[PDB]
Design a protein around this nucleic acid. Structure first.
Lengths: 153, 81, 150, 91, 127, 97, 148, 97, 25
RNA sequence: GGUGAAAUAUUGAAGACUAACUACUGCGAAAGCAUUUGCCAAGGACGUUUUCAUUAAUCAAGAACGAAAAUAAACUAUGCCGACUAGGGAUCGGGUGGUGUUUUUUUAAUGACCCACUCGGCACCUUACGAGAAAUCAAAGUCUUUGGGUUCUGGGGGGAGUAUGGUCGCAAGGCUGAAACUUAAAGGAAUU
């Protein structure tokens, strides 16, 4: 209630007693309800599933990337964008990945990254016309709009 | 050239032309009563057969599908007509 | 002139000048009749039915065995199709290019190829309603033609 | 007869805003409106619930997707290399 | 049977470079370009400049110790004229008339992929 | 072709296009051939495989769905379960299924 | 080669590549004939990784008249997947030790040459450019199993 | 005026042939619409063959060359390459000599 | 002079008469 | 770096040409399209003793596609379909026969090649009796001894692809398309 691309509320089956706490991920291009989205460094490279970038191949596009393993969420989280691993140096766990503008941030090989793009592409590839639905979007965001010219004040 | 009986030509320029470029469009091909040494029943096979002909009981190969005349399979008694 | 193309290919059928014969054919007219009804009861269509008689059996042609054709033989026995042989495989192949452009919409040449298949299929149905063999108000909408021929 | 001629579903916005704009509008406009085919039940029950949400009108099968459409140029390029390199794990 | 080491002679068009490196290229010693005894620019492409270039490196190769300097002549530079320079020929003939021995002579001329469009245009450089 | 083979299982064969039909046909033990779609639910697909062992049936997974497996059964609707009891007297007894 | 470990002014080296010259490829490739590019990836059992290549060429026959003749496409496809097969199952295990135990004595050159020789032979067909790029790490235990 | 059959440079029943990269000025013009002169020279000039096999090691070796195909552009072909502007009928026959 | 480069200059005369359709229509 | 002339690499992100291979040769409606493997098909030569039976040929209007940045010097400058008048060395792909050359695993079978044939073209060359102003062209031939069917267009050259509107497209831009008035030359091939 206040964003662009939806979220996959992935609940985990607590391995410390009969308990089911619902945790949260971002949007993944094409993921159905009841999808067995497995999470593990030993879990195979599948779309929507998550595990270490160094524990997977180069070119692989992941999301909700974090400079630290267990951050539960850092970079590559915005609607419709992605990240691409362009380098693997197994000496001192270093995974060189690329962001949306063109960054060479080489992180850890155990660094958390889930395969897939954020569900919400072509969101800005479509003009809103009515600044009224622009008013409708900020309804659950903040008042960083409307803006004015300092040449007017 | 200049003059020749286009009615009674030699067997020479007769077998060295296309079936429709000849004086009568006839089968420049043939047939074969090929068969495998085990079955008594002979199988009438077409020259450019294409489809693989089998026998009455045991299914076998007699002619392999080719761009033209289905090549014979190793060695089976082929009898023209 | 091979219509829509420029290729002047002369690769066709050259039926013998012998209207009778063979003289080296066993069985009789009953055998070719029952064996042609057997391949129509299997679903091979006169095109494939006539070719299988050529090498599997000893049938050179239908005129060289009986006074009727494999098309007019299936008509008599009641094991004939609802539409012509070329009309069936023209709509079946206009489904392959139409459903293909659905998996590849940017196929400029396949869209023009899909159009020549259908343009040709319409010249075909133009004379088919002109000879009264199929429904006269037959509307060719490859939309229901994909789940019509299959 | 037909209500418009070259304005279709974008006519609900009168003559306000820009022309070239409302044109690209009709594009993805129909791509979320179109009762797209649900690649699960084999029946087209795909409805645009909340830009990326594509529910199945039977047993409720809400599936992830694109904002207005369900997948464009970028979304396609990705899913092809990952499934080929998916079987490249046991190859 | 002495002291080996490569170089990688680069002789493009209008000038030439004659240096020496180790059997990798990373540890290069005694640079001296082909033009420390000529202030003409254009007169650094003929066999004259090429002769005194292999002479300014041969005297210093007998002042430290290195003698064998593998010769890998380069045409021009990938997406370029790729034609052996006017002084990249008289460079091998220059080390002969000086006393520099070679371990083996080989060719390493970078061939362009008919791509990475060369400096010119449709009609290119015309006059 | 695989489409032509099942064309005759419809030209004379007695199959069960449905869930309750294949349950009823197998509860009797007359069906011996079934064909599930790899596109439709695998839970539906699995009960037929667990009931295939019980009714002693030969399973086969055709390419596509039920509206694609419905295209082969010669209709215009959807059906991804073909539990054939009596064949159409062909090779559809011991083929690739 | 690549730098390993140094012991009192006596450092060794290990197989980490095998490049070629331009006059070698520009000499084998002439006009009027056919050339082929075959890409393949092979790994070992010591946590090592390397990539190999193979370029194929054509020749003539007894009493040849024409100074030309091209291929037909249904020839290049078959020879490509044949070279990759033999090298991906003869380099795994004991790293570059076995890799070089078949490339120098030329077993690959005489294998593909006599195989497709039943119809259309083709001469030359070598490895050309082949270079390694991913090594395990350190550990003096595994680095000693390959010494002399 | 219609006087030549190859008109520009070999073009019959097509319409789009890809170009080559010129050596001297870098002028891009179609492969079969320009010129392709292969020059075979040595790593030096062509006079000290005895001097090469007396400064390096091993007898003769294999005699290495810098053989490269220098693509030009009709313009540098009649100026920087072979010219000898030929006549009417001494323009048909194809042959380098 | 070739009428090909010349026909480029006559389409420019129609560009000024096209902006005349706007101020009257 | 450069103009006639002064003034490497241990490895890699991404894409170009898909180098070389790549030519009077192939495929595609035209425009076009330069690697490769696989899916998805399709279309073509040839092959056919398979089937239908005139389903057709050419085409205003209308319909799909279209370098490059609906259009060119998009051109084979050459309308399509049909027949016939021409030989050759070629070449591409396909088909026949050759116990021929040859392969060495064992004559085999086959296979590649070599030889004539051969169709579908792609061309070129020598003559052309013909045609054409000539240049040239097996088409520009079978045209005053003028007629196989048929689409579109031109009539001195300008004005002019312009005026006008009409009409198509988000748009540039096009399609269509004058008139007056002006002058006895414009143009083509060939030749000196």
């Amino acid at each position: 209630s206040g964003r662009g691309a939806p979220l996959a509320k992935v609940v985990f089956r607590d391995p410390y007693k009969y308990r089911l706490r619902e945790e949260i991920f971002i949007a993944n291009e094409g993921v159905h309800t009841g999808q067995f989205i497995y999470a593990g460094k030993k879990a195979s490279l599948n779309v929507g599933n998550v595990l270490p970038l160094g524990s997977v191949p180069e070119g692989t596009i992941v999301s909700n990337v974090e400079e630290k393993p267990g951050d539960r969420g850092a970079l590559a989280r915005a609607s419709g964008n992605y990240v691409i691993i362009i380098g693997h140096n197994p000496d001192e766990n270093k995974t060189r990945v690329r962001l949306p503008s063109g960054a060479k941030k080489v992180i850890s090989s155990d660094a958390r990254g889930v395969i897939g793009v954020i569900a919400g592409g072509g969101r800005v590839d479509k003009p809103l016309l009515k600044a009224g639905r622009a008013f409708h979007k900020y309804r659950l965001k903040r008042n960083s709009w409307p803006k004015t010219r300092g040449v007017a004040m | 050239v200049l003059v020749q009986d286009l009615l009674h030509p030699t067997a020479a320029s007769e077998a060295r032309k296309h079936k429709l470029k000849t004086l009568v469009q006839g089968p420049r091909s043939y047939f074969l009563d090929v068969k495998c040494p085990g079955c008594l029943n002979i199988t009438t096979v077409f020259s450019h057969a294409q489809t693989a002909v089998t026998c009455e009981s045991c299914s076998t190969i007699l002619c392999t599908p080719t761009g033209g005349k289905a090549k014979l399979s190793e060695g089976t008694s082929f009898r023209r007509k | 002139g091979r219509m829509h193309s420029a290729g002047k290919g002369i690769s066709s059928s050259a039926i013998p000048y012998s209207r009778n014969a063979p003289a080296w054919f066993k069985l009789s007219s009953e055998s070719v009749i029952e064996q042609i009804v057997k391949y129509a009861r299997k679903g091979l269509t006169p095109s494939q039915i006539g070719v299988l008689l050529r090498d599997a059996h000893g049938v050179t042609q239908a005129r060289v065995i009986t006074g009727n054709k494999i098309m007019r033989i299936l008509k008599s026995n009641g094991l004939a199709p609802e539409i012509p042989e070329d009309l069936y495989y023209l709509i079946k192949k206009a489904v392959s290019v139409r459903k293909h452009l659905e998996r590849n919409r940017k196929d400029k040449d396949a869209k023009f190829r899909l159009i020549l298949i259908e343009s040709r299929i319409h010249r075909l149905a133009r004379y088919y309603r002109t000879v009264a063999v199929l429904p006269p108000n037959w509307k060719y909408e490859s939309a229901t033609a994909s789940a019509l021929v299959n | 007869a037909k209500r418009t001629k070259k304005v279709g579903i974008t006519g609900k916005y009168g003559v306000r805003y820009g022309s070239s704009l409302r044109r690209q509008v009709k594009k993805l406009e129909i791509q979320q409106h179109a009762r797209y085919d649900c690649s699960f039940c084999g029946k087209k029950t795909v409805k645009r619930g909340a830009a990326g949400i594509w529910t199945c009108s039977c047993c409720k099968k809400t599936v992830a997707g694109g904002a207005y459409t369900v997948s464009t140029a970028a979304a396609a390029t990705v899913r092809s290399t990952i499934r080929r390199l998916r079987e490249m794990v046991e190859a | 049977s002495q002291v080996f080491g490569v170089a990688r002679i680069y002789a493009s068009f209008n000038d030439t470079f004659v240096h020496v490196t180790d059997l990798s290229g990373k540890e290069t010693i005694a640079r001296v370009t082909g033009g420390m005894k000529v202030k003409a620019d254009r007169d650094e492409s003929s066999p004259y400049a090429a002769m005194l270039a292999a002479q300014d490196v041969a005297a210093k190769c007998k002042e430290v110790g290195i003698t064998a300097v593998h010769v890998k002549i380069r045409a021009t530079g990938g997406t370029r004229t790729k034609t052996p320079g006017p002084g990249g020929q008289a460079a091998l003939r220059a080390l002969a008339r000086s006393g520099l021995r070679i371990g083996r002579i080989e060719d390493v001329t970078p061939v362009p992929s008919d791509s990475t469009r060369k400096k010119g245009g449709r009609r290119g450089r015309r006059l | 072709s695989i489409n032509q083979k099942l064309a005759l299982v419809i030209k004379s064969g007695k199959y069960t296009l449905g869930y309750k039909s294949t349950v009823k046909s197998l509860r009797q033990g007359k069906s011996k051939l079934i064909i599930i779609a790899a596109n439709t639910p695998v839970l539906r697909k699995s009960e037929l495989e667990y009931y295939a062992m019980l009714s002693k049936t030969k399973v086969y997974y055709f390419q596509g769905g039920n509206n694609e497996l419905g295209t082969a059964v010669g209709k215009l609707f959807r059906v991804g379960v073909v539990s054939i009891l009596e064949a159409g007297d062909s090779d559809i007894l011991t083929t690739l299924a | 080669l690549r730098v390993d470990e140094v012991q009192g002014k006596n450092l060794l080296t290990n197989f980490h590549g095998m490049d070629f010259t331009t006059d070698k490829l520009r000499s084998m490739v002439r006009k009027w004939q056919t050339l082929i590019e075959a890409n393949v990836t092979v790994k070992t059992s010591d946590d090592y990784v390397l990539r190999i290549f193979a370029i194929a060429f054509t020749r003539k026959q007894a009493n040849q008249v024409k100074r030309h003749s091209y291929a037909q496409s249904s020839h290049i496809r078959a020879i490509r997947k044949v070279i990759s097969e033999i090298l991906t199952k003869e380099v795994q295990g004991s790293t570059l030790a076995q890799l070089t135990s078949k490339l120098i004595p030329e077993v690959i050159n005489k294998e593909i040459e006599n195989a497709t020789k039943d119809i259309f032979p083709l001469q030359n067909i070598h490895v050309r450019k082949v270079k390694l790029l991913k090594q395990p790490k350190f550990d003096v235990g595994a680095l000693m199993a390959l010494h002399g | 005026p219609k006087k030549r059959a190859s008109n520009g440079r070999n073009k019959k029943g097509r319409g789009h042939v890809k170009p080559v990269r010129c050596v001297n000025c870098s002028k891009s013009i179609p492969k079969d619409k320009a010129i392709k002169r292969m020059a075979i020279r040595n790593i030096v000039e062509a006079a000290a063959v005895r001097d090469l096999s007396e400064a390096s090691v091993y007898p003769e070796y294999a005699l290495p060359k810098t053989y490269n195909k220098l693509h030009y552009c009709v313009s540098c072909a009649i100026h920087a390459r072979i010219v000898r502007v030929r006549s009417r009928e001494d323009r048909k026959n194809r042959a380098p000599p | 002079m070739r009428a090909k480069w010349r026909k480029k200059r006559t389409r420019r005369l129609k560009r000024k008469r096209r902006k005349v359709r706007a101020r009257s229509k």
